[PDB]
Design a protein around this ligand. Structure first.
Ligand SMILES: [Cl-]
Ligand SMILES: [Cl-]
Ligand code: NA
Ligand code: NA
Ligand SMILES: [Zn+2]
Lengths: 322, 322
């Protein structure tokens, strides 16, 4: 059994007396030392090596990704550091005055990260970013109107790749891809940006400096105040020394890209994975999408894309949920 | 080429601009950051996984084995922490007054290590320890007299396994197996036993508490003063709370075991690997062997083994060197 494998893996590496306290199974020593077991079997299609490689890479930068305590690549098992339970979302739910300082710490992580020498990961080039918006047609539009508007999509993708190519410049940086409050953990005994524990970095890519900042600040699952986004963009620009007009323009086209795709991601979470609650986030996503399409960089694509995708009226939301 | 693989491995993990400054290749960043490349190819028969597993295990105990910065198991490459150049032997050569405090720190490492929950490594049971002395016949005796005294060896091994079984008790501990001053590195910015950097732990096993202490204190490559050995055994006994008479007896039989085997190891280093300088260490090894055979625990084996192995007279040493 898989339980026998887990027990053999733990015994082999000196953790036989540790107990599970219920992919991310909490384990505790007889005296309360903490660790986390990752169970991602190869036979199932999982691979532990990217997690190990990227956790090491981030930690080499004094970023609080988890230490690897033990590894078993062939059986798809790891034992890693437990980064605790103080999720940014929980901290902010309990005390809203922590939002700004927690978001500043996370932006400080990105600033530091973006100064780093990069690993060779697959790149989010303009063509790839454009194609990645296709979920807006194949999942969101399709779930609502019953077709994916193939011709509008091909025309949008072609124009949008050109716009992305025109507005995104500079070397690519490490991008986490799910950089938002729910995947961040507060570690208050640490110093500075090291207080930001990070998980879910394993499918990281190379991409633009604004990519993780958009996910953080336009986070569709939370109501991030406009002043948090404004001030955090200012701070990122001031701290990095990037050209302001260019970063702002890149940020706007990237916000269109990410919100458009997440329309599809959320549509599919509801329609395929039965999670209707993500549909409550669609009006927020749609608003950020529409805002970004009002940026002058998007002028050639805006009117045609808005004609092709249905606004989330109450009947559209219900059809997304049902 | 292998150089192309190394360069691909470094580039992939963000180290492309690091340069080699000449298995254990020194690498330096453009601003002088340090790391060590391990090149142990599978095609050659090498495996990086035990080094990774055991380095993690030791570091989980706050023992200064090297961090793993990057790994490539399939191609047999690792990038690890550089633990520096302050080898215990160099420190003590320069300043002999450091011998006691450096050896105390190393003994403190073992004390701490032996309190740890163990991994599942192959065990140095009595039969295995006995067989491992056979190099005394197949390499040392053979190099000198032209035969391995098969009958004496079988009789010695049978009796010696019984003696080992009688004198060794308690749970097995992690044993490094090459625990001596040459494989230890001083890290003076660290605290306590963490100042003892350790390398060459990758073929570690489980064995007796005295195993690594014998290699450290009866170190055949150095003249460890009798007072260092005496006081370090006292300190180990006092700090661990082990029964004194039993530890001392275990230490004596283990000293016989390790010195007997190293007669063979050194004979073979000279005869097969052309390193005649190890033969200068044979008189020291022989003296420790003879001392241990005078322990009452060894009484049934002592006279027969001494009759079977030639004393290292000047003509014996020359035949070992030539
Ligand atoms: Cl964790
Ligand atoms: Cl090293
Ligand atoms: Na513990
Ligand atoms: Na550097
Ligand atoms: Zn590995």
């Amino acid at each position: 059994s898989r339980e026998d494998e887990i027990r053999d893996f733990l015994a082999t590496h000196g953790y036989a007396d540790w107990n599970r306290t219920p992919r991310y199974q909490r384990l505790r020593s007889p005296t309360g030392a903490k660790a986390v077991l990752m169970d991602w079997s190869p036979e199932e299609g999982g691979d532990t090596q990217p997690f190990v490689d990227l956790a090491q890479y981030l930690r080499n930068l004094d970023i609080s990704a988890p230490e690897i305590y033990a590894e078993e690549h062939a059986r798809g098992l790891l034992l890693i550091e437990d980064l605790g339970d103080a999720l940014f979302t929980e901290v902010i739910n309990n005390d809203p005055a922590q939002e700004m300082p927690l978001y500043r710490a996370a932006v400080d992580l990105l600033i530091h990260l973006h100064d780093a020498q990069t690993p060779e990961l697959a790149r989010l080039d303009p063509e790839t970013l454009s194609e990645m918006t296709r979920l807006a047609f194949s999942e969101y539009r399709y779930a609502i109107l019953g077709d994916a508007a193939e011709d509008n999509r091909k025309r949008f993708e072609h124009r949008f790749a050109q716009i992305l190519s025109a507005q995104l410049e500079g070397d690519m940086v490490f991008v986490h891809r799910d950089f938002h409050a729910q995947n961040l953990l507060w570690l208050p005994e640490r110093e500075g940006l090291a207080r930001v524990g990070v998980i879910d970095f394993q499918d990281a890519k190379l991409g633009h400096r604004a990519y993780d900042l958009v996910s953080l600040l336009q986070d569709a699952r939370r109501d991030v105040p406009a002043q948090v986004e404004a001030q955090m963009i200012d701070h990122y620009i001031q701290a990095t020394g990037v050209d302001e007009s260019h970063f702002r323009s890149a940020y706007a086209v990237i916000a269109v890209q990410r919100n458009m795709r997440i329309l599809g991601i959320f549509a599919r979470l509801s329609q395929r994975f039965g999670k209707r609650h993500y549909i409550e986030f669609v009006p927020r996503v749609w608003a950020h999408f529409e805002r970004g399409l009002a940026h002058p960089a998007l002028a050639s694509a805006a009117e045609e894309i808005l004609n092709a995708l249905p606004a989330p009226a109450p009947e559209v939301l219900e059809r997304l949920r049902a």
